[PDB]
């Protein structure tokens, strides 16, 4: 009867940010206060509505996007931000009405030699529109010569790995990020 936020927040694996995940929260009641007190979060910033104010509101759908990035980039998960993530991987709209939660995952997403499971998009011909998901892997032309889909000089594979190591600084440490988005439609609202 109540929303299964644990499936998203306590999921054993998280997504590469360039292939960021989305889960649909439907037909349930959302306690956005127990959620504030579910654990210690590095970030719990809402844009448009407070948690208590949200406890007294109802929306059609609630999307829970989840992925992993590094510390210095959590900033970019906000309206009006620029950087590798916001420009090329995960873009929040300026008019964003939702919440951004993030916590430190170094204890789970780093390995001694480096963890290369998590990729991000390094190059792109243009910035992302809001909530766009680019999982293409076209060779990126960085110079004046066209690449013809051949990798080579200034013709790059567009993805790149973080390589999380436990001994990195926190700015380069892995953080798990859950963006909650609120969908209000002309249809029966089912999440309150």
């Amino acid at each position, epitope marked *: 009867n109540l929303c299964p936020f644990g499936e998203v927040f306590n999921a054993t694996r*998280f997504a590469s940010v360039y292939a*960021w995940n989305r889960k649909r929260i439907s037909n349930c009641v959302a306690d956005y206060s127990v959620l504030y007190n579910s654990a210690s979060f590095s970030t719990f910033k809402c844009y448009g509505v407070s948690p208590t104010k949200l406890n007294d509101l109802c929306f059609t759908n609630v999307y829970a996007d989840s992925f992993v990035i590094r510390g210095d980039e959590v900033r970019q998960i906000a309206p009006g931000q620029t950087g590798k993530i916001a420009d090329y991987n995960y873009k929040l709209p300026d008019d964003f009405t939702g919440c951004v939660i993030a916590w430190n995952s170094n204890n789970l997403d780093s390995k001694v030699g480096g963890n290369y499971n998590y990729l991000y998009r390094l190059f792109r011909k243009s910035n992302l529109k809001p909530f766009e998901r680019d999982i293409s892997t076209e060779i990126y032309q960085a110079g004046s010569t066209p690449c013809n889909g051949v990798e080579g000089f200034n013709c790059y594979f567009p993805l790149q*790995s973080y390589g999380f190591q436990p001994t990195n600084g926190v700015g380069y440490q892995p953080y798990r990020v859950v963006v909650l988005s609120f969908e209000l439609l002309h249809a029966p609202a089912t999440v309150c």
Partner: antibody
Amino acid sequence: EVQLVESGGGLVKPGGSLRLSCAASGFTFSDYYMSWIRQAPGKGPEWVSYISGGSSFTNYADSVQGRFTIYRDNAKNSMFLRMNSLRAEDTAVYYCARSPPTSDWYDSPAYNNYYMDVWGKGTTVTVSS
Amino acid sequence: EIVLTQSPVTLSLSPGERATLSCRASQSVSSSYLAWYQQKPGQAPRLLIYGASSRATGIPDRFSGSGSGTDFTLTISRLEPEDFAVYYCQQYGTSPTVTFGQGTRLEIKR
């Protein structure tokens, strides 16, 4: 008919690279986990890497971490293994293999069927001075 | 990491006989998530059984899998000449990584 065809193997000096390709046909490529599994001369199969149908999830054998990158392209019905800094002990036949699927998720983290129901013929990688 | 010990290393039997191949795990395998594969020289492995006892599609009834926890067995009730080959077990339950056994080679006794 379901088929997987690997290519891109070869001989390279230690420290070289290869770009392995796996072309799939006969099924909805996008719905299936895809994996690379290697078999050294005289040995049994060894899991190398996997990627989920939506590319959200990736994992690697501890011994290739940071040298091999797995990715896929569902529009080309294909997946790939970028191998760099090759070492002599990476010599083996490399198979791409499919795992079957179990949905409010783009790429559901609840997935445990990491067995391989379809394999390609394989492609040979030899790393030697 | 789960270690799968397959035995014996080489099994010598005649056609028509029953073959039993053992796969023991160094720790319990969750949900019986244990698969078996057959491989012929110069060929890719092919799946025989998943979930310890589920027969893969197109596999003959003479192949059956059983077991749970740390104890798994593949039985070939009536050996045909095409069944003589190498067999691998593979764990895939609640472990950091999928793991394979080192194989049991079934050869023709004469």
